[PDB]
Structures are given as C-alpha cells and as structure tokens.
C-alpha cells in the first residue's frame, strides 16, 4: 500500500478554469473532491489557535510556551478547526503546522534563538545571582514542560474533535542532516536521542510528516541521501511505536527550496521517489506554494510540468 497526496494549492488556478482533474484521473494521486484545498483526503491547518510565539517583533500569548495561556489557545484552535474542517466525519490526513518553536529547547537555533533568550531572560530577572548552569537548567525545564503541554493538548483536542482523521505535525521528526555541523546524510546523533524521548508526541500522532525538500546546492547523491536519512529516521521512530501502526508520509516539494524558479529535474524525481518507496514509506504528500501559481502564465506552466514530468514520475514509480 502506497498513497500519494496532492496538497498543491491549485484552487488558485480555478479562476482561470484550470481544475487539475488529471492529478487523480490520469496519475492516481489522492485529490480532494473538486480540487478543494481542504476536503475528505487532506486538510492543513496553518498556525491555528493562538500558539505562544514571537512574530517579527511581538510576543503573542506569552511569547514562549511557559508564559502561555492554554485555555485561550484551545478556545481559538477549536474555532479555527470548526471553520476550516466543518465536517465532523473528516477521515483524511490532518496536518497541523505551527512552526513557532521546537519542543526541544536545544533545537531552537538560529532564527529560533530568541525563544532561548527570552526563556533565559525571564529566569535571570527572577534569580539575578544564579549561575549559567542553573539558569539554563531551569529555562530548559520550564520550556520543555509547557512546550510539550501545548503540542500534546492541541493534538488531543484535534483527535477528540475529528476522531477519524489521521493527524500529524508538519516536519516532525526533525533530523538536521547535511548541515555545516552534520555533513553526512545521517541524522544528527543527539536529535535521534531527543526523538526517542519524544514518544509523547509520536505515540499520539497518527502520521509522521518529515519535510524532504531538496536543495539545488547539493550533489545528485546528497539529494538522495538528504531524503533517505529523513525517511529512515521517521521509519525508525514509527516501528518502535506501541499505540498504533504509524504512517510515514514525507512532505515533498516539486521546487528546489533554494532555487524556487526551478522545478525538480526528471533525474531527481526518479531517484528520490525510488528512495522514499524502497525504504517503505507509506506514500508522500506533494506540496506547493501559492506564490508559484499566482498568474495564469504560471498555472499553465505548472500544468505543463505536471503533465510532462511530475505526473508520469509518480505514476511509473509508486502507483
């Protein structure tokens, strides 16, 4: 069993009469009825509720999870879920993407660094004479404790509300392969350790959604290894799991993440889809950004590519 899901926002081409029926008719991809963005096969809830966050620069609902009001978040989340997915019977894939911060304190690097600072800054204002060891310990503790609370409670509420859906957080489990610090395709060792201690998340989720977006600034081999390493990590997690069988459906993009004017070549599609399939993923989801099909020219050009390259590649390796 292997199912590919269409999550490209081709609703944006409907105003020009481009409905993309061949996606399921010719290519066997699971597609919402009438190519609705949300429907019985798939539905993404982007940034629902009021997750605590730092929006570029203001603190929404506490800034960091350990200052957040859970009740307020859940109120608004319910409103959004009901708005976005009105049909109680929803059986499809439900993707939640909040993208504010990682539940592992350590993994809030780089752009996410402010979540570490503010966490630490609060502790220092209370205990000005604590040393860095104590402060770091306390900030980590508080952050991970309420960060889990916010992710776990939202998932629980989601399942309670739409109990037949297959829910997952976008991009989890993380892996961080092919970084300046982790130059192999293998996932970073400490992150694999940290993934094992996040059973609370992976036991509750129905579907793991690792993001396997390719980069142009990589070799042909590394693009395969980038994808292999992330699908391995998610498979390793899923096969250790006790509550249910967990689906691995990696998030896949037909653009190069760092070369957005360029569509994946025939060679990368074959090679990367063959790796996702051969490792035994249960399928994958094709994603796209609204910005790349916001003109009639771009819709017809995207459709040319679907029918000349993307569509055939899925059909001949997968379905």
């Amino acid at each position, epitope marked *: 069993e292997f199912n590919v899901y269409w999550n490209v926002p081709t609703f944006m081409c409907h105003k020009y009469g481009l409905r993309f029926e061949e996606v399921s008719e010719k290519y066997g991809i699971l597609q919402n009825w009438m190519d609705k963005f949300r429907g019985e096969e798939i539905a993404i809830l982007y940034d629902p509720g009021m997750f605590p966050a730092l929006l570029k620069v203001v603190a929404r609902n506490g800034g960091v999870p350990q200052l957040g009001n859970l009740t307020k978040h859940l109120q608004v989340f319910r409103d959004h879920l009901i708005n976005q997915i009105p049909d109680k019977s929803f059986p499809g894939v439900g993707v939640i993407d909040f993208e504010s911060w990682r539940p592992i304190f350590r993994q809030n690097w780089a752009s996410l660094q402010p979540y570490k600072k503010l966490s630490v800054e609060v502790v220092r204002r209370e205990h000005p004479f604590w*040393d860095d060891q104590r402060v770091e310990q306390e900030a980590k503790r508080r952050f991970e404790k309420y960060g889990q609370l916010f992710m776990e409670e939202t998932l629980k509420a989601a399942k309670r509300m739409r109990p037949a859906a297959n829910w997952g957080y976008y991009a989890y489990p993380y892996c961080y392969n092919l970084t300046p610090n982790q130059p192999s395709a293998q996932c970073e060792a400490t992150t694999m350790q940290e993934n094992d201690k996040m059973s609370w998340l992976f036991e509750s989720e129905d579907v793991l959604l690792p993001s396997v977006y390719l980069r142009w600034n990589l070799t042909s081999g590394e693009r395969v290894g980038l994808v292999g390493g992330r699908v391995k990590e998610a498979l390793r997690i899923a096969r250790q799991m006790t509550t249910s069988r967990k689906k691995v459906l990696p998030y896949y993009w037909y653009k190069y993440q760092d070369r957005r004017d360029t569509d994946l070549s025939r060679a990368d599609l074959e090679a990367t889809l063959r790796k996702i399939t051969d490792l035994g993923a249960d399928g994958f989801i094709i994603w796209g950004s609204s910005d790349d099909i916001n003109t009639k020219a771009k819709c017809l050009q995207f459709r040319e590519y679907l029918n000349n390259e993307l569509g055939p590649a899925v059909k001949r390796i997968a379905l």
Partner: antibody
Amino acid sequence: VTLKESGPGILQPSQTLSLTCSFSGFSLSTSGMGVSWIRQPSGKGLEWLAHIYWDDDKRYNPSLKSRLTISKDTSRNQVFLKITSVDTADTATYYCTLYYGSVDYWGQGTSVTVSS
Amino acid sequence: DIQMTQSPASLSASVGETVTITCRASENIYSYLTWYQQKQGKSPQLLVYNAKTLAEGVPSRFSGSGSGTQFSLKISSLQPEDFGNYYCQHHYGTRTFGGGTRLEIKR
C-alpha cells in the same frame, strides 16, 4: 535577615579551618537560595571560595586546588566551610554571603590568622 | 577558568566629575556580572546586578553597561562618599572577582 560567621580565630600551618555561618530571619531550605564564602586579606582584594545552592549543588574556586569543602545543615540552619592544609596565605577575614532574588546579604566577617 | 581584569588599578577625581572604571572578562559571560562598592571599614556593598540593573536604594548617578566580555561602571557627578574601592564579580559558573579599583580624591 542576619548572618554571623564564626571560626577558630587563630590556628597553625597544616591544620583544618572550620568556619560556620549562622542565619537569622531566614531558612536555608527556601527554594532558589544560594550562599557563598568569600575572603579578604588586609589591604588586598576579595577572593571567592565556594558556593552552595538550596539543593546541595556546589561550586568551587579551582584556584583552591581543592582544599575546600562547602556544606549545609537545613535543620541547624547553618553553612560550613572546611579548608585543609592551611598556610599563612590563607590568613584573612572570611565572609559568608546570601543571595535570594535581587537582594544580597553579608555577614560582619570573622578574622582568621594562620601562624605558628 | 574564567579570569576578570579590572582597569584602572587607581583613578583620581574631584567631587562633581564623572568616571568610568572598566572590567574585562577572559571568556564570554553574557550578562552574569555584579558591581560592588567597598568603603574603608565596612563590608562590600551591591551596586549593580544582571550587568545593568541598579541595586535597591542606589543613586542614579551610578550605572552599568555592556555585555559578554567588556563591561563598565559609570559614576556621574561624584559625591564625596563615592571615593573608595570598587569590584566586579562574574558568576557564569565559578564567581571570581576582579582585582578592584581605588577611586582617589584628587588633591
């Protein structure tokens, strides 16, 4: 809140220093609290020795190499400092210090003299 | 081992003048630094915590600045009582002092 250091006053090279800090208006069990031991030889700078937190977690100045032991007894409401192998360079007035929140409390200090 | 270097070792001034004594750290210590005044003693006295936050009941003429490796302590319009010794003390892990500074009354 008040702190009183107590000690031997004078002792001989090679002996063990045993200093006691005693607290009033304050419990050493209180969460987030830390006590430090600092010293100052006459006419010279301050020297940090050791630190202890309410949960028995300790810090030591690796300069002391390491002839120091810090400890506490919550029920006695006291903090202790041991210094083994004293020589004349350990001659100083010794202070204990308390930190809780934004505030900082010092004892009056106990003079310690090391000589034969 | 983190070491703290204060400069200058001595500094002479008159009442009304403004001075800035300095404290440099061997490695980075973010903002884990305190400032202390010691008069002839009298035991030491907290002036500044978290590098920049003024301690309770201390005049606004005092102020602390900087982060990481370079810190300073500015005293505006010096009052007669301000002359004495001054110490920084990091507390990143260990919590060792600098050598201090004696603020001299210019004569």
